[PDB]
Structures are given as structure tokens and as C-alpha cells.
């Protein structure tokens, strides 16, 4: 895997700031169901979809990327909901993601 660092500038969509991608995974989920991971014991957070033309795509995020950190916060041992919350803080317009890519 290769380390990538992406800088997402969230888009205003109504009252919300959106990122333009979807996630799967988390320590509370069944890792054997993750179609993207090389190691099916990997309980990490993975990008499962990327919106064409959205903030994530523009920043260079790709389907299947594993999210290691968001704004310096470790994402390797969090629940699915904890990951969702970290990525979607309404006070944060810019989020930097450290990811690994196969």
C-alpha cells in the first residue's frame, strides 16, 4: 500500500457541509464483509463510494482507500459512528485525510 494525503474542502449543501464520499467499516462491524480490504481481519474505515465531481473526488480520494487519520485523529480503531462524526464536524470546513491505497 501507498500513503496518500488529501485535503478536502467541504461543500455547503443546505445547512450541512458535505464531503462527497461514503464509508464502511469500524471496530463494531464485521470485517469479513468488507469487499475492499486486502486483509479481511482489517476493521478499519474504508471509502466505499466517491461522488463524481464532489469535494472528495476533487481532493484525490479514491474508492477503496483506507482512512488512517482525519485532521490528526487516529481512525484505525474507532467505531463506524465515531468515524462518521469525526469526518462531519460542522465547524470544520477543511479536513485532511491520511489514507493508504493499494
Amino acid at each position: 500500500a501507498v500513503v496518500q494525503r488529501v485535503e478536502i474542502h467541504k461543500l455547503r449543501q443546505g445547512e450541512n457541509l458535505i464531503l462527497g464520499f461514503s464509508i464502511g467499516g469500524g471496530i463494531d462491524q464485521d470485517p469479513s464483509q468488507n469487499p475492499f480490504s486486502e486483509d479481511k481481519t482489517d476493521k478499519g474505515i474504508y471509502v466505499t463510494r466517491v461522488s463524481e465531481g464532489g469535494p472528495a473526488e476533487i481532493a484525490g480520494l479514491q474508492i477503496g482507500d483506507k482512512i488512517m487519520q482525519v485532521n490528526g485523529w487516529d481512525m484505525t480503531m474507532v467505531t463506524h459512528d465515531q468515524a462518521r462524526k469525526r469526518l462531519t464536524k460542522r465547524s470544520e470546513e477543511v479536513v485532511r485525510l491520511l489514507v493508504t491505497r493499494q
Binding site: 461514503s22 464509508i23 462491524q29 464483509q33 463510494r49 462531519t88
Partner: peptide, 8 residues
């Protein structure tokens, strides 16, 4: 189904 995803 047994593996939820979330839109962000």
C-alpha cells in the same frame, strides 16, 4: 446489508 455504509 450486514455491512452498513454512510454518506458523508
Amino acid at each position: 446489508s450486514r455491512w452498513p455504509t454512510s454518506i458523508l
